[PDB]
Specification:
This protein is mainly alpha-helical. Helices cover 31% and strands 6% of the residues. It has a single domain (1-129), classed as Lysozyme. The protein is built from four helices and three strands. Helix 1 (5-14) crosses helix 2 and helix 2 crosses helix 4 (109-115). The PDB classes it as hydrolase.
Length: 129
Amino acid sequence: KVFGRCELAAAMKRHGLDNYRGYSLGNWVCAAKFESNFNTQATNRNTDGSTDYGILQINSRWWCNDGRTPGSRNLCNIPCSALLSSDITASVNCAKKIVSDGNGMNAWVAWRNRCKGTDVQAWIRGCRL
């Protein structure tokens, strides 16, 4: 599924990401835009042989099992393919664990280089939330 910007804001807010560990909603929308372009089906290989899955490009090196990432963990207890569903629940609950693990949203490369320090409120402008 390709979410609309405000559609995604609303689903993320419903799922409790608005100020989750202090990260306002626009942070999560901006990360999603630059990670997946709001596309749940997005997949991208990393240099280390792991793959990133879904709307938040969650990594098989630590968080999910894709059956092909040797020497990795599965800390969200899920197949990586769950992260590609039109429904974002698994991505969001997994996101909550990642962001809670001490490095906050710096876990998302795209967040650190494209959202951090910017006016992320712009990402929810116009949305009914």
